[PDB]
Write a protein that binds this DNA or RNA. Structure first.
Length: 114
RNA sequence: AUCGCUUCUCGGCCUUUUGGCUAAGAUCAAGUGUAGUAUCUGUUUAUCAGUUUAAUAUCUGAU
């Protein structure tokens, strides 16, 4: 059995959050060594190109593949859509604001003047 | 313990949100007494007796 934890911190740079998300997505993927070997026995030495070494024009993908990336796109898009968790419209406390822009400005002022 | 779904709670974003300047740009606010106008609003009580009138009505009188 296995165990780990990862706590959230400051967004410090957009890079940090991006990196966390990449970690998760990367861990998810599971590759088929079948297709890997199939692709391998055709091309051989072309498999291991340096930045500058080797070249074959284009690798054309079966559509079924393309569907995988499209699906992952939609998933990540949703997960990103949920970035900001909204606090429910609570009327219970005292109202001094005149509109929602004013309500939010009063909230930002509450953070900076204690 | 792990995975997923749902419910509530909390933290983080919340710049995504206070058009620029000058001589704070400059200045300041009084009253319903009289009438009338206009608009809505309401209308064109029950007999009978008389007075009256072209006829109504009015007037008078009990309801």
């Amino acid at each position: 059995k296995k165990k780990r934890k990862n706590p959230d911190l400051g967004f410090s740079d957009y890079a940090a959050a991006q990196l966390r998300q990449y970690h998760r997505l990367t861990k998810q993927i599971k590759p088929d060594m079948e297709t890997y070997e199939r692709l391998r026995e055709k091309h051989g030495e072309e498999f291991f190109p340096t930045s500058n070494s080797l070249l074959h024009g284009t690798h054309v993908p079966s559509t079924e593949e393309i569907d995988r990336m499209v699906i992952d796109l939609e998933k990540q898009i949703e997960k990103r859509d949920k970035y900001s968790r909204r606090r429910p419209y609570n009327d219970d406390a005292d109202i001094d604001y005149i509109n929602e822009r004013n309500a939010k400005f009063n909230k930002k002022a509450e953070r900076f003047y204690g």
